[PDB]
Amino acid sequence: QRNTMSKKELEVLSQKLRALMPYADSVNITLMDDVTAAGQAEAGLKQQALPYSRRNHKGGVTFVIQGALDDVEILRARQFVDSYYRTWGGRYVQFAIELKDDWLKGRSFQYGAEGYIKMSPGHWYFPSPL
Amino acid sequence: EDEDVTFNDISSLSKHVDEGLDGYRDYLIKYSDRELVQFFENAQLKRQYGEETETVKRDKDEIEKPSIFALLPAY
Secondary structure, eight states: OOOOOOHHHHHHHHHHHHHHOTTOSOOOOOOOOHHHHHHHHHHHHHHTTOOOEEEEETTEEEEEEEESOOHHHHHHHHHHHHHHHHHHOTTSEEEEEEEOOOTTSSOOEEOSTTOEEEEETTEEOOOSOO | OOOSOOOOSHHHHHHHHHHHTHHHHHHHHHHSOHHHHHHHHHHHHHHHTOTTSOOOOOSSOOOOSOOHHHHHHHO
16 A cells, blocks of 8 residues: 555666675565554454554554553563564554553542542542543 | 620620630640640541541641640640
8 A cells, every 4th residue: 555666666676675685586576465464463462362452543553552461461462472573573563562550559530521639538639631 | 804895796706705715825826836736636626527537737737726625735
């Protein structure tokens, strides 16, 4: 999708790569589908039962895996990620893995459009829409 | 003793009597230890309104005319 090149241009590109790699006899250019890439990523996370969120941009997809994770989850995650990366590279899909504690450190709050935090009984904080 | 007309009705009389004692509350407060005054005040709030009522920790304080029964043993 993202490349609009003519066959002649592709041939020229091929020849220049061949000039950069003096040990290679020829370079074969193959066109792949982005939807396929993104799909295999998301299906792999579901196949591993990991919790995640997905975000889409003009030119990339970010899967954010964050929170309190078990040792088993961390192991499975790092194994899968290392496998996928070796196949597609880090140029289109990114994985962000972050350990988080409790979101608000264990204190009561209202999460509406007018949410707020109870610092202590008798103490309101109103920092931001939660 | 002051003979000038000053009160008319129950709320004005109770305020007139209360106002007459501030000359002595100011004395007790001026020599009592702030920490003890705070202890005896909090421990009365937790009797009346229940111990779950927020412990005040008035660490920077204007102690809001504390009750004399709480103020006297601190002195």
